[PDB]
Amino acid sequence: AANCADAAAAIVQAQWEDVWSAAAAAASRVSAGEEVFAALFKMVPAAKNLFTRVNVADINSPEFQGHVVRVMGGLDILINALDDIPTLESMLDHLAGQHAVRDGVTGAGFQLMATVLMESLPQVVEGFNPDAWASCLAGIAAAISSAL
Amino acid sequence: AANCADAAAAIVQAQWEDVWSAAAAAASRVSAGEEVFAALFKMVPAAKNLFTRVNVADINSPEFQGHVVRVMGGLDILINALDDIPTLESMLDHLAGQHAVRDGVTGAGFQLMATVLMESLPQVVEGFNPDAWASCLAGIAAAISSAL
Amino acid sequence: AASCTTEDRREMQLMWGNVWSAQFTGRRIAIAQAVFKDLFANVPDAVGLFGAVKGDEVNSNEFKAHCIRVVNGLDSSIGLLSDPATLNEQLSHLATQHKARSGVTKGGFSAIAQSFLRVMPQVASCFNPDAWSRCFNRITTGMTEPLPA
Amino acid sequence: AASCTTEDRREMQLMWGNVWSAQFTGRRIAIAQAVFKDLFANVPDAVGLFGAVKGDEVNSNEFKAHCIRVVNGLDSSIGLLSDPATLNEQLSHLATQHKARSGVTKGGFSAIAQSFLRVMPQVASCFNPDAWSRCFNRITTGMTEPLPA
Amino acid sequence: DYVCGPLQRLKVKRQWAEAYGSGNSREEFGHFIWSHVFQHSPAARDMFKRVRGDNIHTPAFRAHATRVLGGLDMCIALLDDEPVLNTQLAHLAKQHETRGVEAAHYDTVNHAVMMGVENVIGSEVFDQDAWKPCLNVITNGIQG
Amino acid sequence: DYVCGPLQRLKVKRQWAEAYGSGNSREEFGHFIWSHVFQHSPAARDMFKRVRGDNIHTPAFRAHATRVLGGLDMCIALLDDEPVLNTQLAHLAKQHETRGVEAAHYDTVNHAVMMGVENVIGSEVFDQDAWKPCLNVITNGIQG
Amino acid sequence: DYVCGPLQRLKVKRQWAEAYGSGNSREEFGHFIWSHVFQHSPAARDMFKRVRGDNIHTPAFRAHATRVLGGLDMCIALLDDEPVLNTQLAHLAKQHETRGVEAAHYDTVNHAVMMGVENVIGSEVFDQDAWKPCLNVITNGIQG
Amino acid sequence: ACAMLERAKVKDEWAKAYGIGAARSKFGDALWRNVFNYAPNARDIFESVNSKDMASPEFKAHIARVLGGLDRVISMLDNQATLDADLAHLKSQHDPRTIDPVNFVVFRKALIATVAGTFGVCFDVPAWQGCYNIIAKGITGSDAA
Amino acid sequence: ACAMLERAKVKDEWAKAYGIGAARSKFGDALWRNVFNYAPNARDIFESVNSKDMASPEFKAHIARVLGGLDRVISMLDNQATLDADLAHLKSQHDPRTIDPVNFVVFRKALIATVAGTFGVCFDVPAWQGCYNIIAKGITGSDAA
Amino acid sequence: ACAMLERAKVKDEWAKAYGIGAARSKFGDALWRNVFNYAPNARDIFESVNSKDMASPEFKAHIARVLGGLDRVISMLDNQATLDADLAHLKSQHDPRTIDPVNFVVFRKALIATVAGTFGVCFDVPAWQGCYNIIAKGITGSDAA
């Protein structure tokens, strides 16, 4: 199960939509991602060698920028399908498979990711709500990482 | 007749309700009463010996506190039935009888009471309106005291 | 009849607000004069009271200015009818301003009042004499606290 | 059951807001006492913790004032549930105020919580134990960060 | 950008009209003004000891403000009639005679009144080059 | 026009009730007050270095304000129970003991709180002759 | 609680967006700011003698404010492009060169602008730890 | 049983139910209709107050008074001191009428109906019966009601 | 006492209160919330039906069944024949659970609250208590309830 | 008679009636419909302004002018100076048309209808007839109208 209260969900939605809607700016989406990873790395540089395939060597490279975006799209997909519990399932399942296959990704690599989004979302979000976010995020961070 | 304008009445209502509604506090009702009498006495101490029956000896006594409350209830009954002119009649008639029988109560003991409420209501009431109040109060102060 | 009721005050307020001119002194003076002219007609020795403001030359600047001040005063009270607490203070002040003038009797007001009653209907639209009276007298009562009679 | 959901907080907020008395200390003390009386009954050595505030004389001014302070604190958190970011700071503060008192165990809260659960339904109108519990425990969790157990 | 000309007067007349409303919000209009006056010159309160200048939220003071704005209304209304205007301004002057109103005091009240007027009618439209000078004409009259 | 009498207390109690709203707008109520406090005494911020007194728009500070108004609510609520009130006032006093709160500081906060209350309930109805004195009873208590 | 980081910039960008509205209320947004500026530093008006700094309620001045906020919009919009930003900041600097703008003057305008922004978007949400530093980046640039 | 909490509660609910203005008249009318339907014979008891015409000012006046009593008493539940004295007073007013205390039970029933009926499913039946009895006892020293 | 009229009446009101569709679920949820608030200890009795989660299908299912019982029984008040048999049946279902009959009193209270709270001031308190008892008696042969 | 008060009043009401914008056109159209129904023969008098088509711009233009005259004159009632001069002017404009002054009476009637009809029962009939005449007199020195 990848759900949280119908309302705890609507909150996250508004907030996420607030910083990442289809109508933002190519530059904003990039920075959110850039920051997310830069932070995800300073926390555990032992993880950099995990994105070698996507020019992680140069975070500002197209290859990597492209990767980052793919991640955002995903988080969006999730956050947004938070109201449709059964679909979010497939959502997760998929992402899970996509990660279980990447040799090296740990079920705690995600724990780190979480801490990062949590420590930096309030920087960009308006009336950020850690509770609603923790309630919905851990719900799916747990589903995506169903291996290792 | 125990009436005042339909509107002059509605005003008093809101104001009275403002300080004495069934949903106040046992402590607030007491103080309004306590003050009303304390003031009613400093004005005419010659009246204290009129409530001897209700432990007026000790204003904070249960017996007296009980009396005070009975008075408030009454004023409430009146103020509130101000819109129904014919019922306020019976209201008055009754109170009248209840007072005409108490040997000592003067048709001016009430005049004093009035002056008291008037000088102290604005202390507790919000946008206190002496006019509306005088117009409705004198209407019934006059009906209750229909003897002596 | 009885007393100046809330309903009455609302009415009083409109009858007045409608003939009132917020930008010029024209109508004010016109009405003020119509009143005084009528007062002075029904009360001979009255004119003798406005010596300080040339009550003889009703078209004199001194008196016009006076009218302006009177009409203003009445406006003050009429509008203040909605806030009796404050009206009381205001009327008390007016009262004092009148206690200070020898010759000003409670009965003088009783007269000017009749005058207004004769004038207003001429300039005001759908005038309500009764309501107006009730409240006018409420304002009077206050203005005339210690005055003789 | 699970966690204090948004819906839950709204509920928690009402159950509380309805028995709350914004103008007097009456009900507050009445409720506070009913709770402590029940806590002290199910946990003997608990009373020994409120020596500084005469926890023996529950009707003592020292303790009443205490109840007032406690009920106030819980009000703070309950209302702050709508703004978790700030709630966190607030609960952290309460946490510190409690880390400073030897004898205050995480399990002590676990108890007082049961007490509230026994009391609220008596004074509160249509009480929702489950929802209340979920959110009460959310507040507890924060207040009791480093406390033993 | 001054000179209370005939046109500026007409303007102030109309804008005053809007601010001095119909006959209700005058309590709040007065409060705003006087409130602002004392926010600038807290000391000024000492001159109004007779009318509860310590608490403008008082029937006593409210009544005072009533008189003030009322006077003000007359002057603004007389603005087009120079002769009668000065006669009135004279009357107002005598009403202040003894009292120690300094020039800076009138500056404050004038400012406050404009603030009050702007507050009600809005910054978009508020002829300052009309109020400023025309208000002075009135003030300088009471000045003596 | 002072003396926090039993009736003035009842009044403050009810008006406080309206201002301290239901349990939502308290964030803005707090903000207004403290905002106003620092607008008057910018220096005062230095006393709140532990709770982000530099930016009141902070969960840290918001939480602080929460505690303050909360304490204030208790005192106002205890106003009718002299004995318990002073017991509490005593507690509050000890909570300030070390901190160098000058008398003028309390005057400011008191003023601010009233502004805050008036802001919400309106100038029409706001018993200043009740808040002023009753607030002092509380302040003078914490005073020590 | 400073450092105009890339995220703080994104924030300021969005909040500025809301305040600088759609293209209407800009007149009032400008008025508020500049109004506040002179309420703090009445003297500052003397620097704007060319654009009716004596009456901000003037097409002349309104036009001025338009230019200012406009410049400000560019800087905030360039915040993410360091290189082009400084190029612009440079241009702005030269536009002030002669004029005697003291550091404290920028502090005031900066403060005012934030007040303006907060006024529109609300105290609940208004990242001060972002505006404060980011605005300085712009100011310190014009500084020279 | 009528605990201090039960009282705070009974008051709370009474307040909500008794209403503010016209609602009170309505409530009163509802209450008494019930009283006389629950015990149609108890009507003759109030002929002194023209119970013949349930809409007569005479009777509405009565209703007014009894409700006022009910209010002032309930509101004082958190003050034994006054409560007892006032209840004692009411006893003095009812003793001479020699009323079968069973009628006060009918009342309790009717009151419950009327208050719950107006207040909602939240109505605390036990708390009401308990505290109602503290009052009935005080007015007609009987069983416990 | 529970007269034939009182029964016709109790049915009439139950019908109005129990409602038609979604109203029934609501009522049930209301009724049980009351039951467990009136006697919080009685909750542990229903752990067999997951009373832990008052919104669990397991429990809603339970509520459904008990309400259905309540309905089929009340509706049969005008037919001793069936009523007795069905009540007897219910007894068979409850006897082995060894339940303190006092709980059935709590229920009566809670039911009154819920029904009156939903039905309105017209609620006939005495008729309900009387006929409710005919059912309680039949289910747990005790005092008279 | 047309006192200074009566004038302040006539103006006040005219203002309310004449309206602000589209209301004026409406009023004008109403007024003239009345004029020509009250005296159908007076229509031929205005063929110079295409009175054939009462909706023709030619005639609407006329209506516009006469109303404008009516307004500028009424508004000047509190200033004999101007009033007389302007009325005199209007006389110069009408004298050469040799119009039977009786028509001006028809007008007065029609005006009263139109203004009272638009203004309301508050309409001061005598004040209007009086002051209307001051204008009619000035435009066609006749009886007193």
Ligand code: HEM
């Ligand atoms: C909640 C945050 C996360 C989401 C939603 C997410 C999403 C994605 C998506 C959509 C892809 C690319 C799918 C594709 O191949 O088409 C991906 C790839 C990947 N993710 Fe994640 N991811 C998350 C967290 C993490 C974390 C914490 C790690 C470990 C530090 C991680 C490591 C990887 C790696 C190594 C790849 C493969 C990159 C490549 O193709 O070379 N992900 N992720």
Ligand code: HEM
């Ligand atoms: C408008 C205000 C007043 C109201 C509505 C009022 C109401 C009442 C009521 C309800 C009672 C008790 C009825 C009962 O015996 O059950 C009462 C009793 C009494 N009232 Fe008044 N009253 C008012 C003013 C006064 C005044 C001015 C006096 C004289 C100072 C007065 C003297 C008494 C006395 C002596 C009793 C008898 C107390 C006793 O039982 O020992 N009342 N009044």
Ligand code: HEM
């Ligand atoms: C009954 C007839 C009245 C008489 C005999 C009377 C007489 C006077 C007199 C002689 C003055 C002094 C004028 C001067 O020397 O400056 C005066 C001033 C005044 N009166 Fe009256 N008055 C009467 C009615 C009223 C009424 C009804 C109002 C309006 C409600 C009114 C408002 C004023 C005001 C505002 C002042 C000017 C105070 C000042 O600015 O100094 N008067 N009156």
Ligand code: HEM
């Ligand atoms: C689990 C049981 C708890 C224990 C054993 C405990 C114990 C204490 C003790 C002994 C004090 C110190 C009293 C003094 O010396 O002044 C205290 C203070 C306090 N407690 Fe707790 N507490 C408990 C639960 C709670 C809860 C749930 C709340 C409310 C949400 C609360 C709110 C407070 C507050 C506000 C203070 C006063 C701080 C001050 O003003 O100095 N406590 N507590």
Ligand code: HEM
């Ligand atoms: C510019 C507009 C002003 C106008 C039109 C005006 C008008 C008035 C009027 C009509 C009165 C009442 C006189 C009476 O009825 O006895 C008054 C009183 C007074 N005015 Fe002014 N005033 C103005 C400015 C000022 C200023 C600048 C100050 C002081 C800062 C001031 C101080 C006073 C004082 C002290 C009183 C006497 C209060 C009392 O009755 O005790 N006025 N003013």
Ligand code: HEM
């Ligand atoms: C008149 C109303 C006032 C009340 C009711 C009040 C109440 C409080 C309360 C309850 C606390 C938190 C104590 C704790 O839980 O540790 C507090 C803290 C504090 N108060 Fe007050 N206070 C008032 C006025 C003031 C004033 C006038 C100042 C300074 C201008 C002030 C300065 C402080 C400071 C510095 C703190 C400590 C902040 C921290 O926790 O770091 N207080 N106050």
Ligand code: HEM
């Ligand atoms: C921090 C934001 C600021 C920005 C973005 C800014 C922007 C501008 C711009 C674009 C112009 C118009 C240049 C032109 O088109 O000729 C201007 C003019 C001016 N600025 Fe600034 N400015 C700022 C702060 C300040 C401050 C702090 C002051 C003074 C307290 C100031 C004083 C002036 C003056 C005196 C002018 C010239 C007015 C004129 O054209 O006569 N500026 N500013």
Ligand code: HEM
């Ligand atoms: C707890 C419920 C009751 C309360 C609070 C109550 C209160 C009152 C009050 C305030 C009065 C009028 C006092 C006066 O004379 O001024 C009254 C009168 C009376 N009550 Fe009660 N009462 C209650 C129940 C009953 C019941 C159950 C009966 C009889 C079935 C009853 C019979 C009477 C009668 C006959 C009067 C006399 C009215 C008259 O003839 O003037 N009361 N009651």
Ligand code: HEM
């Ligand atoms: C007149 C009211 C009541 C009615 C009509 C009633 C009816 C029912 C019905 C229909 C069932 C389920 C039958 C089945 O197993 O298919 C049931 C089950 C049960 N009832 Fe009652 N009941 C009533 C009151 C109570 C009370 C007061 C208690 C205990 C406080 C109680 C305890 C139980 C228990 C424990 C079950 C077992 C459910 C399970 O575990 O499956 N009932 N009741």
Ligand code: HEM
């Ligand atoms: C008091 C009422 C009247 C007023 C204020 C008035 C005003 C005017 C005005 C302003 C004009 C046009 C001036 C111009 O040529 O620029 C005009 C034209 C005219 N009026 Fe009147 N008028 C009034 C009544 C009448 C009446 C009663 C008649 C005849 C029954 C009349 C017949 C005419 C005619 C024939 C024209 C000539 C229009 C043309 O052919 O151009 N008017 N009037």
Ligand SMILES: [Zn+2]
């Ligand atoms: Zn200012």
Ligand SMILES: [Zn+2]
């Ligand atoms: Zn401005």
Ligand SMILES: [Zn+2]
């Ligand atoms: Zn201030």
Ligand SMILES: [Zn+2]
């Ligand atoms: Zn104020």
Ligand SMILES: [Zn+2]
């Ligand atoms: Zn500022």
Ligand SMILES: [Zn+2]
């Ligand atoms: Zn702020």
